[PDB]
Amino acid sequence: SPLSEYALRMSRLSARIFGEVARSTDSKSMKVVSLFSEQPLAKKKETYDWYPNHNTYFALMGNLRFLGLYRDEHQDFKDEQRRLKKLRGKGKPRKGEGKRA
Amino acid sequence: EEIVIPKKKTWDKVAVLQALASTVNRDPTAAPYVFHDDPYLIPTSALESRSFLLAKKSGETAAKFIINSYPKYFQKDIAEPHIPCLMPEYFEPQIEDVSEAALEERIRLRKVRASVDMFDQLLQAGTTVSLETTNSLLDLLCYYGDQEPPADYP
Amino acid sequence: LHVDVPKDVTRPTITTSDEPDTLYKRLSILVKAHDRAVLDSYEYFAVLAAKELGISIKVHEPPRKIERFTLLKSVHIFKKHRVQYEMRTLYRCLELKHLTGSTASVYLEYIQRNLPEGVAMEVTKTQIQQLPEHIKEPMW
Amino acid sequence: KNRAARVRVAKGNKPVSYEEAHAPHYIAHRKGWLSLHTGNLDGEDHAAERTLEDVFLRKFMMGTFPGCLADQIVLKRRANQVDICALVLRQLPAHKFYFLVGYSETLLSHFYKCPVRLHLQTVPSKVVYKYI
Amino acid sequence: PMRRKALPPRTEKMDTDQDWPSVYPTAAPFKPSAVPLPVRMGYPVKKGVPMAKEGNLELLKIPNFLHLTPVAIKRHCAALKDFCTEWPAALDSDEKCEEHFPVEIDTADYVSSGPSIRNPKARAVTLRVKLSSLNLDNHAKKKLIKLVGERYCKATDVLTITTDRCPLKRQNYDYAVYLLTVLYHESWKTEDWENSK
Amino acid sequence: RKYLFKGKRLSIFADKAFADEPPEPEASPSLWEIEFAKQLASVADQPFENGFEEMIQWTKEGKLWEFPVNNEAGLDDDGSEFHEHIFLDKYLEDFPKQGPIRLFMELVTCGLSKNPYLSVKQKVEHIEWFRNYFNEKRDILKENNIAFT
Amino acid sequence: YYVDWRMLRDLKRRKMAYEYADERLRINSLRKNTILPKDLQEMAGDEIAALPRDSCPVRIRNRCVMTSRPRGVKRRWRLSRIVFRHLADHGLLSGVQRAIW
Ligand SMILES: [Mg+2]
Ligand SMILES: [Mg+2]
């Protein structure tokens, strides 16, 4: 049914009290209220802190391994494969001195 | 007719823990709480008791050294409310300009030799130094007797 | 201790203020856990603690929730073969009544400090207060 | 055939602990959970952050106590407190354990900004549930 | 340099009339060397018994209540009695409370495990008052009910104002009290356009 | 005989009718006073005796949460009030009092009032940004018959 | 070191979206309405376009934090199905069990 003057003027009196939009606003223009009432996706802690600081973990554990307070079985395994590979003559070439000139 | 509302009691944040602590007594069959509660790790003799604690204090100092020497890895703060005592410490002055304020920082950090150098440099330029600030320098020098504060490091 | 006992144990200082105390008509404590047995033990500890402090308590078990999701079992292809996982949530509601604000703080601290690992609490305090003095009398 | 977390049969000479013996479908039936936090309960947040901390805390303890761990560690979170309960072999001298406890506690309390405590129960040797 | 030998468990020295609360003052993990009980846990193997306490990971995985025993809880609550305050005797019924304290303010706290104590749901506040308790003229009550819309429930005659827009709980709480005051005063005010209903 | 508090005294000093006349912090704590206080604490410094004493120390240092849990402990938004967050039309005075810009800014300030994730300072910054934006676009607005500032 | 160069590009996209969140909010609000002149809206359509492409929050992809897998991830744990199953099948996830019913 239609909204009579009493109904419409009461609705505006209510919106004025509850801090709602008081005017007649299109559905398109109600997005401005949504944009400024909701935290944006890029500002949510889930988004910007999605990853752990992989650099802190890799660096910190490497520093601890060199201080003797942490043991990396994986790295010790790789360190011996490089040592053996260098003896076999398959080691990494120096930069700028690769097979192709 | 009017109801009488009781007057609210108030207490410190540690009051409840203190009340619960009062109930319990020392366990006669257990080692001091500092020592680990394992038969293999219980101090048999008085020499081990002190050695075991010094090893604990030594391990605490090894962690604090790493935290204070690689602070960039211990800077992300995920604790709400914020815990100040679990953040890396910085003791070296970060004010580079040679001003009475920079001298005040060194005095606050308690560096004795660096503060003397910047005080003399301030005198060399002749810039004004407050008597209260000049007294803060003497306090540090007089109390430590011209010697850098004792500390342990590599 | 057989012979060596504390003489005058120190007790915390509790000072009565002049501010009026809050009046909680109800105080609902919804604990959640994956384990039913832990809730049973916590229910016994919490109901015993309330009865010892004079608080009125009732307990019921809200219906449990089971959340299930499906995943792909293989690392590559073999779509039709799946593995399913579930998480079970169990509830115990401790509904307290007619508590002053001092009684609700000491009780909640005591039971929250003793909350087992894996248990989540959701206190829902319901305070009762008079009407605003302006509202009491209509003013034009 | 299912290969997930199943210590397969040999010729009766492979010692396995209680944790290893039971396959995934016995979780919540015969064996419990190694980590206990509130982050996977319904209507609770920060499951991802609790899970990442667990992965690291397990890799840290393996390296910090190399060859001294009798079984997987048990992680218990209460409020902001973290509690690590580890079965450790009696290989190292006693004083060395006091050093590693002080070090590992202080380091992990300044890394996650929470009070972290280490609880060590020492076993003479690994406990064998059955030989498979 | 022989290997170190572990001492015998201290349970051996524990009397059967000891003060157990002192043994486990606070929440701790299960310590087979401190708990003087022959407890066993584990699905037993065929022709086998459940595993023993020493080196038992399953007992360690349990959140035990050894620190919370019936003797401890009673000794604890005895100390905690000085903190409590007495509820006013006159308010012996819920109807009596509605008479003198018609406004109900709902606030929720949440306890979880983690480094952060922050929960988004803790800001919300809910005010519930009955219109019968409010002094409203026949005109006022009709105006109050039209403005509030679905917040008013005819069956229960309760107005529910839920405010979560403000960041903090003290702000949301003060806002709900404000919303009631404006609705009450506006309801009594009569506007000329109201004569056209 | 050897009564501890019965007998002659030095009498160099007199009864303190006036007591503690100068304030304890006559000056900001000096290194001498700051260091002596640290030593007084060490006099009674004994190790933890149980989990309660350990938790008591952690609480005093902020390491352990306070109980009962308050999810907003230490979280005060600049000591603001509800009316500061909700009523934001005071900041729209510089904008045109009527017209399309007013209709738009009404929607903007309505959303900001319903925003619990921003402080008042941040909300004001959003409004200030639009004031400077429309000022820059004065010429395009004038073509459309809208007059700004 | 992060898992791979793809996770590195994603991390930077997440940190540039956080920088440009307010800006892209304020500008985009001027476009999501019917109350402002179309001349202003046509111009705001280009100010938002001129911002760097990595400021756009729809170029973020949720990857397994430990293997950097683009698909198969569960958003509550930020892990791929393969990594999740390894932790779940070992009793290391608190409350996760197999679903039998
Ligand atoms: Mg790679
Ligand atoms: Mg996408």
Side-chain angles (χ1 to χ4, degrees):
Chain A
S1 63
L3 294 180
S4 186
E5 177 173 45
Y6 186 86
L8 294 165
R9 296 214 64 179
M10 282 292 278
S11 300
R12 296 194 297 184
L13 180 50
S14 81
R16 188 206 66 77
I17 285 165
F18 290 119
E20 297 301 288
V21 299
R23 211 167 300 278
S24 296
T25 59
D26 295 341
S27 56
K28 290 198 175 188
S29 305
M30 274 298 301
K31 181 157 178 68
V32 181
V33 187
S34 174
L35 288 168
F36 279 106
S37 64
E38 299 182 23
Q39 191 171 32
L41 184 55
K43 295 289 271 180
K44 301 184 89 179
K45 201 167 173 191
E46 192 209 49
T47 301
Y48 74 72
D49 281 348
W50 179 263
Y51 297 113
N53 194 348
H54 285 262
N55 283 4
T56 298
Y57 292 99
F58 178 96
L60 177 64
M61 298 323 288
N63 274 281
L64 293 173
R65 178 167 169 276
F66 273 38
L67 301 167
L69 289 170
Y70 178 79
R71 194 172 296 174
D72 191 352
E73 284 172 321
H74 188 103
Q75 192 60 75
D76 285 302
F77 170 91
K78 282 201 304 204
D79 286 23
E80 286 299 273
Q81 299 284 131
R82 182 180 292 181
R83 191 193 54 76
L84 292 156
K85 198 155 180 185
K86 191 183 296 189
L87 294 174
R88 181 166 63 262
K90 300 303 198 196
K92 201 172 174 78
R94 179 153 167 171
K95 195 184 175 65
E97 315 189 355
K99 170 182 172 181
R100 294 175 275 184
Chain B
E1 296 185 350
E2 183 172 10
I3 314 301
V4 303
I5 307 181
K7 296 305 189 189
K8 62 192 304 193
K9 290 172 176 169
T10 56
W11 53 83
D12 195 19
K13 61 185 175 178
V14 292
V16 168
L17 289 172
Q18 283 177 0
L20 297 170
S22 72
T23 74
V24 298
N25 289 6
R26 177 181 74 248
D27 186 350
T29 69
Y33 182 73
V34 296
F35 301 108
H36 222 85
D37 200 324
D38 183 73
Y40 186 78
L41 296 174
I42 278 159
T44 71
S45 68
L47 173 55
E48 268 175 23
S49 296
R50 298 182 200 85
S51 177
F52 282 171
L53 295 190
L54 283 164
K56 203 186 189 185
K57 186 176 181 172
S58 175
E60 293 178 21
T61 304
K64 289 290 291 180
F65 161 87
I66 291 152
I67 295 151
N68 296 352
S69 296
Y70 304 88
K72 71 176 281 177
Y73 307 131
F74 299 96
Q75 265 170 8
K76 191 181 183 174
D77 182 54
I78 56 163
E80 315 299 321
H82 160 80
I83 313 169
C85 68
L86 294 180
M87 296 306 289
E89 299 174 284
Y90 313 92
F91 289 110
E92 289 295 344
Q94 303 189 10
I95 298 293
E96 301 297 327
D97 183 27
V98 178
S99 171
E100 183 194 310
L103 165 69
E104 286 166 81
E105 167 165 71
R106 280 139 186 80
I107 293 161
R108 196 196 69 260
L109 298 166
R110 290 171 282 177
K111 305 293 180 172
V112 300
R113 210 72 63 182
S115 67
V116 165
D117 301 336
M118 295 297 183
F119 175 75
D120 287 12
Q121 192 174 359
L122 286 163
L123 291 182
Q124 289 156 41
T127 59
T128 190
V129 63
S130 172
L131 179 49
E132 199 164 25
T133 296
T134 302
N135 286 22
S136 306
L137 184 61
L138 283 168
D139 290 23
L140 183 71
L141 292 167
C142 290
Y143 177 77
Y144 285 102
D146 309 313
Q147 299 141 17
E148 287 165 5
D152 306 314
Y153 63 90
Chain C
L1 307 181
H2 303 128
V3 61
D4 193 29
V5 295
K7 173 158 147 187
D8 298 319
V9 190
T10 188
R11 297 203 298 176
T13 291
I14 318 301
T15 60
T16 187
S17 81
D18 307 310
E19 185 182 355
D21 202 317
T22 310
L23 293 178
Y24 294 105
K25 176 180 188 175
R26 194 166 50 264
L27 197 151
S28 169
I29 306 175
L30 180 71
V31 293
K32 323 185 279 181
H34 304 279
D35 182 339
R36 197 171 194 280
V38 178
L39 295 174
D40 301 335
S41 305
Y42 193 72
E43 168 185 16
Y44 173 91
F45 152 69
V47 169
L48 175 54
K51 287 171 172 176
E52 286 287 314
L53 296 164
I55 298 154
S56 296
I57 194 159
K58 290 172 63 174
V59 181
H60 62 91
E61 193 204 5
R64 80 189 181 182
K65 178 163 187 303
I66 304 183
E67 176 174 359
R68 310 199 176 88
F69 52 103
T70 308
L71 290 178
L72 208 76
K73 203 165 73 188
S74 189
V75 297
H76 187 255
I77 63 169
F78 302 134
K79 174 67 150 173
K80 291 190 183 184
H81 300 95
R82 312 291 190 87
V83 63
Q84 284 153 342
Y85 291 91
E86 69 186 13
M87 301 163 292
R88 300 196 175 189
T89 305
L90 279 73
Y91 305 92
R92 202 64 45 84
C93 190
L94 315 175
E95 293 178 350
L96 290 60
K97 269 263 158 173
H98 289 43
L99 310 99
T100 63
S102 296
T103 299
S105 55
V106 64
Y107 179 82
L108 280 169
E109 170 154 17
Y110 178 67
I111 64 134
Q112 284 174 353
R113 282 187 176 282
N114 288 313
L115 191 64
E117 54 270 19
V119 187
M121 202 184 287
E122 295 200 319
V123 187
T124 308
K125 291 164 281 161
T126 300
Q127 178 181 359
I128 53 165
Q129 46 180 21
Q130 304 212 334
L131 278 164
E133 297 302 322
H134 301 101
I135 291 180
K136 282 192 177 188
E137 182 57 31
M139 177 178 71
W140 297 274
Chain D
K1 301 163 63 178
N2 301 336
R3 298 287 284 199
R6 289 161 171 88
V7 175
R8 307 201 77 77
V9 69
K11 300 192 171 182
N13 312 293
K14 186 194 299 190
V16 298
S17 60
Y18 187 95
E19 172 64 31
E20 295 177 327
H22 294 104
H25 55 269
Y26 293 113
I27 296 163
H29 298 267
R30 300 188 182 173
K31 64 170 171 174
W33 289 290
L34 290 154
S35 69
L36 282 179
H37 56 101
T38 66
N40 301 333
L41 289 170
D42 172 73
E44 293 278 304
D45 306 322
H46 309 317
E49 296 92 305
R50 296 304 86 77
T51 300
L52 196 292
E53 290 161 12
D54 286 337
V55 171
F56 171 81
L57 275 178
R58 289 178 192 282
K59 293 160 158 277
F60 182 87
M61 286 289 297
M62 283 182 215
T64 307
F65 301 84
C68 299
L69 278 171
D71 221 333
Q72 278 167 293
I73 72 176
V74 166
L75 300 160
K76 292 173 176 301
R77 296 192 178 87
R78 286 189 285 98
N80 60 328
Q81 296 174 83
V82 177
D83 299 295
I84 315 182
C85 310
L87 295 175
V88 291
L89 299 159
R90 289 173 183 177
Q91 294 182 6
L92 286 178
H95 67 96
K96 293 210 199 316
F97 279 111
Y98 274 81
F99 179 103
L100 295 167
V101 167
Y103 157 79
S104 60
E105 282 181 2
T106 301
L107 195 83
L108 300 167
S109 298
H110 284 68
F111 189 73
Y112 284 133
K113 316 294 177 183
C114 56
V116 185
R117 288 187 301 165
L118 207 80
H119 307 271
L120 296 184
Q121 188 208 123
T122 66
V123 306
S125 64
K126 288 197 184 181
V127 181
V128 184
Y129 170 69
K130 75 183 199 176
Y131 286 88
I132 188 169
Chain E
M2 278 300 300
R3 285 175 286 279
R4 175 193 192 83
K5 182 172 181 179
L7 299 176
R10 59 196 198 81
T11 58
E12 295 180 9
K13 313 143 61 184
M14 286 176 179
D15 299 3
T16 58
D17 63 303
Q18 65 180 345
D19 186 357
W20 176 252
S22 307
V23 183
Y24 261 69
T26 59
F30 174 72
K31 293 164 284 182
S33 62
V35 177
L37 302 173
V39 183
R40 299 175 161 278
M41 187 172 177
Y43 191 90
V45 298
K46 290 167 181 178
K47 307 184 152 188
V49 289
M51 305 186 299
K53 63 181 181 175
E54 301 88 354
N56 208 334
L57 204 68
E58 287 293 332
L59 285 170
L60 201 70
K61 280 192 280 184
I62 280 174
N64 66 81
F65 277 73
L66 291 166
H67 67 295
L68 296 167
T69 52
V71 176
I73 297 159
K74 294 166 186 185
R75 203 189 297 177
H76 286 164
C77 296
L80 298 192
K81 272 185 182 290
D82 305 316
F83 297 73
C84 296
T85 54
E86 292 193 26
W87 177 265
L91 300 181
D92 69 319
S93 75
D94 285 8
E95 299 93 313
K96 183 69 168 189
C97 301
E98 293 192 344
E99 177 182 358
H100 294 71
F101 301 94
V103 178
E104 281 172 25
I105 305 302
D106 279 27
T107 49
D109 303 354
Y110 302 83
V111 186
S112 305
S113 70
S116 173
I117 203 168
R118 304 268 172 265
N119 194 306
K121 301 181 284 182
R123 70 182 186 263
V125 182
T126 299
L127 186 148
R128 277 187 317 280
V129 64
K130 276 185 183 184
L131 298 194
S132 300
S133 295
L134 293 158
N135 172 46
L136 289 159
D137 176 81
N138 169 60
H139 171 251
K141 187 172 177 177
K142 291 175 170 188
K143 193 166 176 187
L144 189 43
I145 291 163
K146 287 173 181 291
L147 294 175
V148 301
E150 297 80 49
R151 298 176 186 80
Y152 176 75
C153 179
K154 189 179 180 183
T156 61
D157 191 51
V158 172
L159 166 59
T160 311
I161 306 171
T162 307
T163 54
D164 62 333
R165 73 198 299 171
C166 298
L168 300 186
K169 191 197 280 178
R170 62 164 183 80
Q171 298 172 323
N172 275 320
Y173 159 70
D174 278 352
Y175 178 48
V177 171
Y178 168 92
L179 280 173
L180 191 70
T181 308
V182 296
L183 292 160
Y184 171 85
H185 280 130
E186 288 287 350
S187 294
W188 276 88
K189 189 191 308 191
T190 300
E191 299 288 74
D192 288 352
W193 52 264
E194 294 203 85
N195 303 335
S196 64
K197 82 182 301 200
Chain F
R1 286 191 176 183
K2 285 276 175 184
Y3 298 120
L4 295 170
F5 310 104
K6 206 79 182 177
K8 169 175 170 187
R9 72 190 192 82
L10 288 174
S11 179
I12 285 181
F13 296 84
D15 199 321
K16 298 305 188 188
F18 298 85
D20 193 46
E21 185 164 13
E24 172 174 19
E26 183 178 2
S28 303
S30 57
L31 181 60
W32 288 91
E33 294 173 345
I34 292 161
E35 295 280 319
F36 188 69
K38 293 165 175 175
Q39 291 174 2
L40 284 163
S42 300
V43 169
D45 175 28
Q46 297 299 326
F48 298 145
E49 304 180 355
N50 43 67
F52 287 123
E53 287 186 28
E54 181 171 54
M55 289 169 80
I56 288 163
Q57 184 63 52
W58 290 357
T59 293
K60 285 178 183 164
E61 297 179 335
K63 273 180 70 171
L64 186 58
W65 289 346
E66 290 171 15
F67 285 88
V69 164
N70 178 14
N71 295 62
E72 301 185 344
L75 192 75
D76 194 325
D77 54 1
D78 312 332
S80 288
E81 296 295 342
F82 76 93
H83 57 79
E84 303 181 32
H85 286 266
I86 291 151
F87 314 114
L88 294 166
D89 292 2
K90 63 192 281 179
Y91 305 108
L92 298 182
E93 286 171 19
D94 298 356
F95 293 75
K97 301 303 200 189
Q98 296 300 331
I101 291 174
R102 193 81 196 189
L103 292 163
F104 174 78
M105 292 310 298
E106 277 170 356
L107 289 161
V108 167
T109 47
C110 187
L112 291 169
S113 56
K114 305 170 169 179
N115 194 311
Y117 317 106
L118 294 171
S119 74
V120 176
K121 187 181 292 185
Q122 291 169 242
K123 291 176 195 190
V124 167
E125 288 163 7
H126 287 282
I127 294 153
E128 288 171 330
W129 183 94
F130 290 102
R131 193 190 302 161
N132 300 3
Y133 180 91
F134 294 127
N135 274 313
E136 293 154 25
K137 307 284 185 302
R138 261 177 191 174
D139 298 323
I140 308 307
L141 287 168
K142 285 157 186 174
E143 294 159 26
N144 303 133
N145 311 329
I146 300 168
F148 188 86
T149 305
Chain G
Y1 279 113
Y2 283 76
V3 179
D4 69 347
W5 293 104
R6 291 158 194 176
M7 173 181 282
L8 195 67
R9 291 199 307 276
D10 191 22
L11 177 80
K12 293 173 180 190
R13 282 159 185 151
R14 285 168 189 275
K15 294 174 84 161
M16 191 175 281
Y18 182 90
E19 294 156 13
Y20 286 79
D22 289 330
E23 184 152 56
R24 293 179 65 83
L25 185 73
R26 296 153 167 167
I27 298 159
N28 190 59
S29 82
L30 297 161
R31 308 169 58 236
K32 300 289 162 178
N33 69 79
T34 61
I35 294 169
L36 286 183
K38 307 301 181 193
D39 291 344
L40 192 141
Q41 299 200 332
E42 291 286 85
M43 283 171 201
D46 299 339
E47 296 167 272
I48 199 75
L51 295 174
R53 206 184 293 277
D54 270 13
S55 70
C56 307
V58 303
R59 290 163 62 83
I60 293 156
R61 169 64 70 118
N62 294 312
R63 316 179 75 83
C64 174
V65 291
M66 279 174 70
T67 62
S68 179
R69 199 178 194 269
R71 289 177 279 205
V73 187
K74 294 295 296 194
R75 203 203 191 99
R76 180 169 189 175
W77 297 280
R78 314 177 184 168
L79 301 171
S80 66
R81 54 175 178 80
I82 300 153
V83 172
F84 173 93
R85 284 195 65 206
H86 193 77
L87 296 173
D89 290 357
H90 276 85
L92 308 166
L93 302 187
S94 181
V96 191
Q97 62 202 80
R98 293 280 195 88
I100 313 169
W101 85 106

PDB file of all heavy atoms in Angstrom, chain A residues 39-50:
ATOM      1  N   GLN A  39      34.868  -2.084   6.976  1.00  0.00           N
ATOM      2  CA  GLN A  39      36.308  -2.118   6.775  1.00  0.00           C
ATOM      3  C   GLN A  39      36.609  -2.704   5.397  1.00  0.00           C
ATOM      4  O   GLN A  39      36.090  -3.778   5.064  1.00  0.00           O
ATOM      5  CB  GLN A  39      36.972  -2.953   7.868  1.00  0.00           C
ATOM      6  CG  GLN A  39      38.481  -2.850   7.907  1.00  0.00           C
ATOM      7  CD  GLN A  39      39.070  -3.507   9.135  1.00  0.00           C
ATOM      8  OE1 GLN A  39      38.537  -4.494   9.640  1.00  0.00           O
ATOM      9  NE2 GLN A  39      40.174  -2.959   9.627  1.00  0.00           N
ATOM     10  N   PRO A  40      37.427  -2.049   4.575  1.00  0.00           N
ATOM     11  CA  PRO A  40      37.718  -2.602   3.247  1.00  0.00           C
ATOM     12  C   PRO A  40      38.479  -3.915   3.339  1.00  0.00           C
ATOM     13  O   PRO A  40      39.112  -4.236   4.345  1.00  0.00           O
ATOM     14  CB  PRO A  40      38.570  -1.515   2.579  1.00  0.00           C
ATOM     15  CG  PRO A  40      38.364  -0.291   3.393  1.00  0.00           C
ATOM     16  CD  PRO A  40      38.098  -0.755   4.781  1.00  0.00           C
ATOM     17  N   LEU A  41      38.408  -4.683   2.248  1.00  0.00           N
ATOM     18  CA  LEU A  41      39.016  -6.008   2.239  1.00  0.00           C
ATOM     19  C   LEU A  41      40.523  -5.942   2.450  1.00  0.00           C
ATOM     20  O   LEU A  41      41.096  -6.814   3.113  1.00  0.00           O
ATOM     21  CB  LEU A  41      38.696  -6.719   0.924  1.00  0.00           C
ATOM     22  CG  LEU A  41      39.182  -8.165   0.796  1.00  0.00           C
ATOM     23  CD1 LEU A  41      38.672  -9.018   1.944  1.00  0.00           C
ATOM     24  CD2 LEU A  41      38.752  -8.756  -0.534  1.00  0.00           C
ATOM     25  N   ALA A  42      41.180  -4.918   1.905  1.00  0.00           N
ATOM     26  CA  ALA A  42      42.629  -4.822   1.992  1.00  0.00           C
ATOM     27  C   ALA A  42      43.104  -4.374   3.365  1.00  0.00           C
ATOM     28  O   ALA A  42      44.293  -4.517   3.670  1.00  0.00           O
ATOM     29  CB  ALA A  42      43.155  -3.857   0.930  1.00  0.00           C
ATOM     30  N   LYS A  43      42.211  -3.842   4.195  1.00  0.00           N
ATOM     31  CA  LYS A  43      42.558  -3.347   5.518  1.00  0.00           C
ATOM     32  C   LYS A  43      42.289  -4.364   6.616  1.00  0.00           C
ATOM     33  O   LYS A  43      42.565  -4.080   7.785  1.00  0.00           O
ATOM     34  CB  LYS A  43      41.785  -2.059   5.810  1.00  0.00           C
ATOM     35  CG  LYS A  43      42.157  -0.896   4.904  1.00  0.00           C
ATOM     36  CD  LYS A  43      43.542  -0.344   5.213  1.00  0.00           C
ATOM     37  CE  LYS A  43      43.481   0.743   6.269  1.00  0.00           C
ATOM     38  NZ  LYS A  43      44.827   1.295   6.575  1.00  0.00           N
ATOM     39  N   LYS A  44      41.763  -5.536   6.272  1.00  0.00           N
ATOM     40  CA  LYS A  44      41.478  -6.563   7.261  1.00  0.00           C
ATOM     41  C   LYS A  44      42.742  -7.356   7.567  1.00  0.00           C
ATOM     42  O   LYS A  44      43.539  -7.652   6.673  1.00  0.00           O
ATOM     43  CB  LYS A  44      40.377  -7.494   6.757  1.00  0.00           C
ATOM     44  CG  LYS A  44      39.081  -6.772   6.441  1.00  0.00           C
ATOM     45  CD  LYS A  44      37.968  -7.724   6.042  1.00  0.00           C
ATOM     46  CE  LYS A  44      37.182  -8.203   7.250  1.00  0.00           C
ATOM     47  NZ  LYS A  44      36.077  -9.124   6.874  1.00  0.00           N
ATOM     48  N   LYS A  45      42.924  -7.694   8.844  1.00  0.00           N
ATOM     49  CA  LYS A  45      44.163  -8.338   9.260  1.00  0.00           C
ATOM     50  C   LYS A  45      44.354  -9.683   8.575  1.00  0.00           C
ATOM     51  O   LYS A  45      45.490 -10.142   8.418  1.00  0.00           O
ATOM     52  CB  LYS A  45      44.182  -8.502  10.777  1.00  0.00           C
ATOM     53  CG  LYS A  45      45.573  -8.683  11.354  1.00  0.00           C
ATOM     54  CD  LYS A  45      45.571  -8.534  12.864  1.00  0.00           C
ATOM     55  CE  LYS A  45      46.924  -8.884  13.457  1.00  0.00           C
ATOM     56  NZ  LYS A  45      46.874  -8.999  14.939  1.00  0.00           N
ATOM     57  N   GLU A  46      43.266 -10.331   8.158  1.00  0.00           N
ATOM     58  CA  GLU A  46      43.400 -11.599   7.451  1.00  0.00           C
ATOM     59  C   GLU A  46      44.093 -11.407   6.110  1.00  0.00           C
ATOM     60  O   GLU A  46      44.880 -12.259   5.685  1.00  0.00           O
ATOM     61  CB  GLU A  46      42.032 -12.244   7.244  1.00  0.00           C
ATOM     62  CG  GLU A  46      42.111 -13.696   6.785  1.00  0.00           C
ATOM     63  CD  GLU A  46      40.923 -14.115   5.944  1.00  0.00           C
ATOM     64  OE1 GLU A  46      40.576 -13.382   4.996  1.00  0.00           O
ATOM     65  OE2 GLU A  46      40.339 -15.182   6.226  1.00  0.00           O
ATOM     66  N   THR A  47      43.806 -10.299   5.424  1.00  0.00           N
ATOM     67  CA  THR A  47      44.370 -10.080   4.097  1.00  0.00           C
ATOM     68  C   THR A  47      45.833  -9.655   4.174  1.00  0.00           C
ATOM     69  O   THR A  47      46.707 -10.307   3.593  1.00  0.00           O
ATOM     70  CB  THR A  47      43.551  -9.029   3.348  1.00  0.00           C
ATOM     71  OG1 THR A  47      42.193  -9.468   3.235  1.00  0.00           O
ATOM     72  CG2 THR A  47      44.114  -8.804   1.956  1.00  0.00           C
ATOM     73  N   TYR A  48      46.119  -8.563   4.884  1.00  0.00           N
ATOM     74  CA  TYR A  48      47.467  -8.006   4.839  1.00  0.00           C
ATOM     75  C   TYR A  48      48.452  -8.847   5.647  1.00  0.00           C
ATOM     76  O   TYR A  48      49.662  -8.793   5.398  1.00  0.00           O
ATOM     77  CB  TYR A  48      47.452  -6.538   5.282  1.00  0.00           C
ATOM     78  CG  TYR A  48      47.271  -6.247   6.756  1.00  0.00           C
ATOM     79  CD1 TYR A  48      48.282  -6.501   7.669  1.00  0.00           C
ATOM     80  CD2 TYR A  48      46.100  -5.671   7.224  1.00  0.00           C
ATOM     81  CE1 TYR A  48      48.120  -6.218   9.008  1.00  0.00           C
ATOM     82  CE2 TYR A  48      45.931  -5.382   8.562  1.00  0.00           C
ATOM     83  CZ  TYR A  48      46.942  -5.659   9.450  1.00  0.00           C
ATOM     84  OH  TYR A  48      46.777  -5.372  10.783  1.00  0.00           O
ATOM     85  N   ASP A  49      47.966  -9.623   6.612  1.00  0.00           N
ATOM     86  CA  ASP A  49      48.795 -10.566   7.361  1.00  0.00           C
ATOM     87  C   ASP A  49      48.444 -12.009   7.011  1.00  0.00           C
ATOM     88  O   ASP A  49      48.417 -12.888   7.872  1.00  0.00           O
ATOM     89  CB  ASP A  49      48.667 -10.338   8.864  1.00  0.00           C
ATOM     90  CG  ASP A  49      49.496  -9.173   9.349  1.00  0.00           C
ATOM     91  OD1 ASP A  49      50.348  -8.684   8.577  1.00  0.00           O
ATOM     92  OD2 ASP A  49      49.305  -8.750  10.508  1.00  0.00           O
ATOM     93  N   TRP A  50      48.176 -12.267   5.730  1.00  0.00           N
ATOM     94  CA  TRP A  50      47.865 -13.623   5.295  1.00  0.00           C
ATOM     95  C   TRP A  50      49.042 -14.564   5.518  1.00  0.00           C
ATOM     96  O   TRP A  50      48.860 -15.704   5.962  1.00  0.00           O
ATOM     97  CB  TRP A  50      47.468 -13.610   3.823  1.00  0.00           C
ATOM     98  CG  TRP A  50      47.149 -14.953   3.271  1.00  0.00           C
ATOM     99  CD1 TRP A  50      47.988 -15.768   2.577  1.00  0.00           C
ATOM    100  CD2 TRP A  50      45.896 -15.640   3.349  1.00  0.00           C
ATOM    101  NE1 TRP A  50      47.339 -16.923   2.222  1.00  0.00           N
ATOM    102  CE2 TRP A  50      46.052 -16.869   2.684  1.00  0.00           C
ATOM    103  CE3 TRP A  50      44.658 -15.335   3.919  1.00  0.00           C
ATOM    104  CZ2 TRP A  50      45.020 -17.793   2.573  1.00  0.00           C
ATOM    105  CZ3 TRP A  50      43.635 -16.253   3.808  1.00  0.00           C
ATOM    106  CH2 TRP A  50      43.820 -17.467   3.140  1.00  0.00           C
TER     107      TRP A  50
END
